[PDB]
Amino acid sequence: HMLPKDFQWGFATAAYQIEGAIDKDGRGPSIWDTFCAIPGKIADGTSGVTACDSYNRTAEDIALLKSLGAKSYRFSISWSRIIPKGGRDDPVNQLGIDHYAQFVDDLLEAGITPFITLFHWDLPEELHQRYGGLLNRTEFPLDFENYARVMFKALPKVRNWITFNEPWCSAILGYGSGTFAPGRQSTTEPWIVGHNLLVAHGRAVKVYRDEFKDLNDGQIGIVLNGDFTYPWDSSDPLDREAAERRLEFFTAWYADPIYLGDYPASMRKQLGDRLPEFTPEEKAFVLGSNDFYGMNHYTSNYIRHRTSPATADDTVGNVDVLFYNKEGQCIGPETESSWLRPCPAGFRDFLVWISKRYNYPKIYVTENGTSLKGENDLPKEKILEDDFRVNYYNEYIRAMFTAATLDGVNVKGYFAWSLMDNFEWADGYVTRFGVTYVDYENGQQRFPKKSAKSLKPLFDELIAK
């Protein structure tokens, strides 16, 4: 009835979502700086120029992280602050490096373990323009590999590294539906982008293990999102299979090559030649390139097989992703995110799914949290109340606990998304995911919500001292 004492817990952000200061200390433009410039791409017509101004408030956030009793903190490095043009032949920005080097020292001094994300969607614009960015099988993995190397040298004190955050998003949403940067819409390119992300990952991991890992006994891994699935009609085997295939398209897409050494068989049979093949060199990079499994999880769905054959523009694996099953049952209540409905049981099920499929690897839950329906349109100290979010964390974390203590899922860490309300990409600022209310009307004042303080006693209970 107790998690291990070295179980890390805390909060998670991303650079472009909280930092602001986009034109500070020589930061180059990312693809998201340009994406937000396009009218209609962002719902509230906003961007991350100010965000939470966390670039300027490192002492304030660190103090907040302490206030809530965080043992760890997951954040991302803005690539274009380190190398403004991104490439392995481009000038390196020391002021960018120093800003993060000082941030790590400030965390270490305040016993908060940094979990660092190398790439959180903010690819330097120059790389996109120079050779096609993520789409380029030859150039991008080499540039990422170098950028990883640079950060490994720059931050010797950091022992917890993440390569890519949610490559599924960068590929499907960035190149399929075009809802995320760079906003391309293709039936072929997402599957090419996904492949490149994998190779870049493998390249960075090898460099880390060979030159930096044994320096301080660290670990590196990729972060994969994925919502669990249940048959829309469990009496129909086509729905049972659909629900499984849907996980394969979402998650095993990246994880099967990293652990098994090849793409899921189900993906190869639908996509065919559109799905790339690993060269020996590429496979040698990708296979076994996880020290730990980085996991993002938010919700679950009912999956209904489709009667028609898979279209060219399909990305979910020829299925219907629903919130009601055939009997009229509902996944969970309505949130501010039409795609997110609470389902704590699905959290534990995904944990066990991963464990069974990949021989029970070390798992870090790098993201977990919820939005709240109509949260942005209600009074201040009523935002500080967030019983809905409190309940979300209570049940989800306890579901994770069961997964660890009963099933024996090797989860060593949990990070709540997010430390505070921030730029929710295409949703803008309308959608709040934070446990801390950020006051944008009044200079991003930090006001912790009821859920923020609820995480300390919850984890106090579940961890063993």
Residue numbers in the entry: 0 to 464
Could you pull the original sentences from the published paper?
Our laboratory has previously reported the crystal structure and biochemical characterisation of a glycoside hydrolase family 1 (GH1) β-glucosidase highly expressed by Trichoderma harzianum (ThBgl) under biomass degradation conditions. β-glucosidase (EC 3.2.1.21) catalyses the hydrolysis of β-glucosidic linkages in aryl-, amino-, or alkyl-β-D-glucosides and di- or oligosaccharides at the nonreducing ends, releasing β-D-glucose monomers. This class of enzymes has a critical role within the set of enzymes that compose the enzymatic cocktails designed for plant biomass hydrolysis, thereby alleviating the inhibition of other cellulases by cellobiose during the reaction. ThBgl is easily inhibited by glucose. The molecular basis of glucose tolerance in β-glucosidases is not completely known; however, it has been correlated with structural features at the entrance channel to the active site rather than the active site itself.
The tailored ThBgl (ThBgl-Mut) crystal structure revealed that the selected mutations mimicked the active-site entrance of the highly glucose-tolerant GH1 β-glucosidase from Humicola insolens (HiBG), acting as gatekeepers, as postulated for the HiBG glucose tolerance mechanism. As expected, the mutations did not affect the overall tertiary structure, thereby preserving the conserved GH1 (α/β)8-TIM barrel fold. The ThBgl-Mut and ThBgl-WT structures are very similar and display a r.m.s.d. value of 0.28 Å over 464 Cα atoms, with each monomer being considered. Moreover, the predicted catalytic residues E165 (acid–base) and E366 (nucleophile) are spatially conserved and thus not affected by the rational modifications. As predicted by our structural analysis, the mutated residues W167 and L172 function as gatekeepers and affect the positive-subsite region topology, narrowing the ThBgl active-site pocket, while the −1 subsite is fully conserved. At the other extremities of these residues, the conserved W338 (corresponding to the residues W349 in HiBgl and W339 in TrBgl) delineates the new, narrowed entrance to the active site. The L167W/P172L double mutation had a significant impact on the glucose tolerance and stimulation of ThBgl. In the presence of 0.1–0.25M glucose, although ThBgl-WT showed an accelerated decline in activity, ThBgl-Mut reached its highest levels, which represented an approximately 300% increase over the value measured under the no glucose conditions. In fact, the catalytic efficiency parameter (kcat/KM) of ThBgl-Mut is approximately 5-fold higher than that of ThBgl-WT under the conditions assayed.
